[PDB]
Symmetry: D2
RNA sequence: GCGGAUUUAGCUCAGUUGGGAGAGCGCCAGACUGUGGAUCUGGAGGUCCUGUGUUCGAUCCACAGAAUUCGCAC
RNA sequence: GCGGAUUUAGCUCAGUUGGGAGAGCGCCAGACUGUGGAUCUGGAGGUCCUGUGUUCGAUCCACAGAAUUCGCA
């Protein structure tokens, strides 16, 4: 053909071999999304169950995924360093992960929320980015970063939404009240003013969600300081 | 934070400025997809209408998309050379496009096919790639390439399936019949042996689908040799 | 062989076809270099001829180089859109250009300065970077940028070195004297305090060096506003 | 400035952190270079001493280089995984290495060969590529690969040049003679026909050259199987 | 895109309805001698592409995903 | 992750009910002049981060998405 020459303008990027690959997918404008479909605040259980369902099915579909961690509207997938999926073409991996997460989310939404059919202008869309890590310690520190982020965001949102619902404050009022406040102050505000003991909050909300290949098992525990949890799973390293 | 340092391992790729951008999305294993949901052969109208609906909605959402061409399980989107969407980040554009096409396809499928609800193991997924073209002549030639490819492939499937249906041949028999045949030979085989006049086939089947920003208008015309069609639409160039 | 596998960690980068290529080479620490070998200030003529000789020879060797502009310790080379040199492999182009400029500079230095044999710890080194530009207008604007920067740096160096040499100021003293000063002030300082008419300085010093493929001709002219200079050379565009 | 905007078209590439970097430089058309300056065959000691001098000086100039291995017209440099030279910018590293190796080669050439002044059309140029390796085992395997390649190439050149020089053959005759020949066949040809025992060849010629930071020490030993050679130098991993 | 064929040790290839994995070259060690060549002896290396399903048991059987190659076709 | 402020001519800052965009500099040319200095005239360059609407009309207003910067950690 006299037209195929344009194919020469395409440029592929193969991700460095024998390197750990993290693919992180993130909900596009899921704040507005959470508002449109009237999500429970601070945390809506079933929506998180949809997220976990999509992630788990995806994980079941692709064996190279050793571990997955999700919270709020985000999910991180760890691919074994020796992954050869799609010859490690970055675009294939990221666009496939985003496509899969979006479609599976739509499906499981149709399963968990039949009362709230999806509207064409507020469909769940995900972006996806690939990140390379040469040593496992960086993987540990990454998931540590994500879990710390989950802890901070959950504490803030629980305090905020308890201030809004129980103390009937305005979002602006709750926002100003939390200004310059630290973890101890948020816990004290929740317990004394809202009558809520944070430590008694669901483990899933405060710790996020971990899916690990054992069998596929789901945990909601601290992985930041618990070295034995990692050490007992050496196949994560391989 | 002692963990945020891992964020430094990320690499962004900004697409060269003042360049025409083509993002092509492609259905993942849609032959098998067409089999599972028992698509009509050679061409199933309603499915193609799902594709076109999804693509048109997508084009409607992003004003930077000047032109789209789709056929079978593929769709190409032209973004104007001075586009600043997501600061011209390749990953954002591609993962977002795959996600959008996927979700819109899922939505419109429930609309056109209420009789065939989607199965979790056969959801429509799309990959996506970004290609840069510095001169409009290469864009013209690109879409020319896509239309020629559509013509050849359609001619193949229509001839094959007419050989299976009208002459009651076995797939291997029809395939053996098509060895060393060219477009003209396939046309002559269809007309003389199967009694089907190709030129009378649906225009969408023979030319594919064009969505162009005018209002958004859909065409099923030749864009390869019709220079005036392009010349009459200078806003495509800039 | 059981060791050849490491070849898979290599990454090639082919520069986008049908795009103008600019390769800019720049002297490594040529201020300290100028100090060690006792360069005349503000401008040492013979050094500039070494630069120009190296650039001209390099350009003579590779016909794809259509235009070159050099000043101080930098030089810019324009390679035509359909250049296929080293299959447009970026790395080959850049390392080759840097190696060539360094070696030719060493050679022509050995020719112009036999009195000052080069010392191993002060050899002329060059870096090299490649930049892609999709439209010729951006090429014009690039070389315009380079000539403007050349004017700025030359004016600064002449004023600075006239304040240090013609007067008896310290380099830091002159630096502080020129702080927050503009072209008008520099001109006025040269005139009133140093008794130097900037405009009467050599044209090469104020405008830089242009090498054009016509035959290779060397110019010291304005290319910023002179449209006719470019328009009279359409082969530069092709 | 209204022209500085072109600066936005540059794209820099920062190498993945915590990864071992190998920068390999290789002589451009050094077959022709070897012919032009009438190099001794198969191996010219003084030329190898020029290469080695250049490499040692370069390594001496940049403390980040932990190990270097060179042979024939190529040299490989290992940079420790946490190196921050030029912020791990690929272009700067490679073009700088090419420039340095080229200039140093010119200088030491002027020192070892006062009898053979360099001709402008045959100055020594080097290309350079950077390769990332996430694990040290790959470093060991890389240098192993290069040393094996050295063994093969040296055996070939010694057998070949003994066939042209000693048996007074034409290069094409030797080329055809070595077609389909294996190491054993080459050894027997040298031994029986040329009266040459390969094992008695200089250790530098058959093993290549190793420069290691200990002090900078030079070795001509096997590094493929001698694990202790690496193990006794743990600072290479760090 | 359509179809066939293939994926097991470092390289080339076996193998068994469906049962516990091998040979030649190459590599390392020792003896031997002409040396890293020749012969001989010894030894090392493998997620049998990645998952799933059935089964007491999968390299094999069924399905799916990835990769290699050759045909036909622009 | 949560919030404040910011993005307007090449640079630096105003900036407006909601209506018609500017200054200093920079920069091109011309007259006279020490020089493309100053001084003098004319002129250019602004998609005011990007889209939609309310409107007879949008730089400010209302919705959506993005970027720089500093806090709270």
């Amino acid at each position: 053909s006299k037209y195929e020459y344009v194919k020469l303008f395409e440029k592929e990027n193969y991700l460095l071999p024998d390197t750990y690959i993290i693919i992180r997918v993130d909900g596009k404008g899921f704040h507005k999304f959470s508002q449109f479909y009237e999500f429970e605040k601070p945390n809506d259980l079933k929506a998180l169950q949809v997220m976990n369902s999509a992630a788990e099915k995806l994980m079941s579909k692709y064996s190279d995924v050793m571990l997955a961690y999700g919270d709020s509207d985000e999910y991180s997938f760890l691919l074994r360093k020796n992954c050869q999926l799609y010859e490690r073409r970055e675009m294939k991996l990221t666009t496939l992960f985003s496509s899969l997460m979006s479609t599976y989310y739509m499906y499981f939404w149709s399963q968990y929320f039949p009362d709230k059919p999806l509207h064409i202008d507020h469909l769940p869309n995900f972006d996806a980015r690939a990140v390379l890590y040469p040593d496992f310690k960086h993987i540990r520190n990454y998931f540590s970063w994500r879990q710390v982020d989950c802890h901070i965001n959950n504490l803030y949102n629980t305090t905020f939404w308890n201030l809004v619902l129980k103390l009937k404050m305005t979002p602006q009022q709750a926002e100003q009240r939390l200004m310059g406040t630290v973890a101890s102050d948020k816990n004290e505000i929740l317990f004394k003013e809202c009558g809520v003991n944070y430590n008694n909050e669901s483990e899933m909300y405060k710790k996020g969600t971990i899916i690990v290949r054992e069998e596929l098992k789901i945990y909601h525990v601290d992985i930041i300081n618990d070295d034995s949890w990692w050490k007992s799973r050496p196949w994560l390293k391989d």
